[model samples]
Target chain A: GPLGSMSDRKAVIKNADMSEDMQQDAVDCATQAMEKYNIEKDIAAYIKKEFDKKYNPTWHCIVGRNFGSYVTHETKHFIYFYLGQVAILLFKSG
Target chain B: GPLGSMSDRKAVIKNADMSEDMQQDAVDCATQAMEKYNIEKDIAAYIKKEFDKKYNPTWHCIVGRNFGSYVTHETKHFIYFYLGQVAILLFKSG
Candidate 1:
């Protein structure tokens, strides 16, 4: 058996590789996200300080950007994470 | 019936309250929004500088946080801005 040493250690990273497409998606989504909603200042600070500020300021924004992308990005990977129902749940309530 | 304010001039700001409720809604929705998606670090930073920077570093994050809130916040006022089809379109695609 050629599978002696390697136990088929396969890993499936849904958002793995962090490709250029992913990066673009993140940016586009953030931009599009802005179109749909308006973020307040102090609240943004809360997220940054509580969750994102620990990292480099620049790095922190990167994560947020990717988050915006996730909602509408990477249909190639996972879409459940897309928008997370924040859109429909809220939009529907109206 | 009198319908004049400051010499028959009027303006309406829907999410203008920015009161405790708005702030709370922003925070609540952001936390909830994150539950749906995951944002990587570097991408977060890009948004900070490219689009968010130039202002006080701390202030920039504020807008993004509020954005998350808007998608799911303030159903009382406007829902069209809510999630802006980012969720349905992307999730539906998958």
Candidate 2:
């Protein structure tokens, strides 16, 4: 029940529809982000926030996963990764 | 843009209805968050991602501001604040 992204490319609205495995994945990732950063806050909950607003269920999943990779790996700018993600999603005809 | 919350009560969908002031606020807040974290990432861009999905224009504004406070002040889990915000928005008669 922790950090995925505060973030996702979007955020989660309700945890409903979210799977146990997904939640666990989110929990696992969030735990790592918090500990790694030495962040005292509830990184997990904030990360979960990403799922609610993404609109699509899959976006929620990808962001949850991405949150883990971006934060844990801590390489290329995750922030920009999302902009390109959203921009493509945006300009592309949905 | 950089880091808002990756959050809002919800998240921003598209920035079209978003005002210049809101965009600037997001930019300003995002900048502050990134610097405070000493994160090399473009926090502003990720933060703006929140506004694109929140649906309501105002959530975008609040998250922008909250992003600054939550990251800068560095207390109170901003995660729960928004979860509650979303929960209320979810279950309550909107």
Candidate 3:
């Protein structure tokens, strides 16, 4: 069910199912996950900026590298982690 | 020896043991991997650009977050996946 949950979350984010206000919530969830993983701020910022610049219009971006092989519950954890960062950035920028 | 093999591949790519021309080969590998994973071109391009601007000269850049916890065989697979992205960028720039 972990994979399914992750898939569901991915679908939500990828499809931009979140309300406009909830966008920040999504980014916050991602940021927390990145911090939990000790992803450096600069790198995280870089990722955030890039993700926003490119995929912002698309609603959701696949943050993971491999689907069948690397996709996992933990991958979901980082997805949320980095998504949190994206949210905070949006909140501030908006 | 999976880990060791991964480590070896990392060493080869990270250390630049491949000839200068083989650099394109590395990029090709990453491109194939990303295609296999269905990563979008714009996201991939943005990542390639950022990696070149920041970590190109560093010889080795850890492409993933949460190394210890998220670290897995799949992680290694994506490391190569993104590293391939980084490589192609370098080949083009150089």
Candidate 1 overall Cα lDDT vs. reference? Answer: 0.29
What does candidate 2's lDDT look like per residue over A1-94, in tens digits? 4457455433232332334555444445444544454221234234433433333211211221121101111111112112212210010001
**Reproduced native contacts, each prediction:** 0.04, 0.00, 0.00
Each model's backbone clash number: 12, 33, 16
- TM-score, chain B, each candidate: 0.25, 0.27, 0.26
**What are the RMSDs of all candidates, in order?**
17.7, 17.7, 15.1
Residue lDDT tens for model 1, A1-94: 6375643312122343334554344334443544454343232333333323333221122222223332222233221122322221011111
TM-score, one value per model: 0.18, 0.23, 0.23
- TM-score of chain A for the candidates in order shown: 0.26, 0.27, 0.27
Tens digit per residue, CA lDDT, model 3, B1-94: 3544343322124534344544554455445545554343433444444445554521222333222211212211223323422222222211
lDDT (10s digit) by residue, model 1, range B1-94: 6644335211122343344553344334433444444342232333333322332222122222223322222323221112221221011111
The numbered model that scores best in lDDT is 3
Docking class of 1: incorrect
Reference A-B contact fraction recovered by candidate 1: 0.04
Model 2 DockQ reads: 0.02
Q: Score the docking of each candidate (DockQ).
A: 0.05, 0.02, 0.02
Off by over 4 Å in 3: A1-15, A19-24, A27-94, B1-12, B15-26, B29-76, B80-94
Global local distance difference test of model 2: 0.28
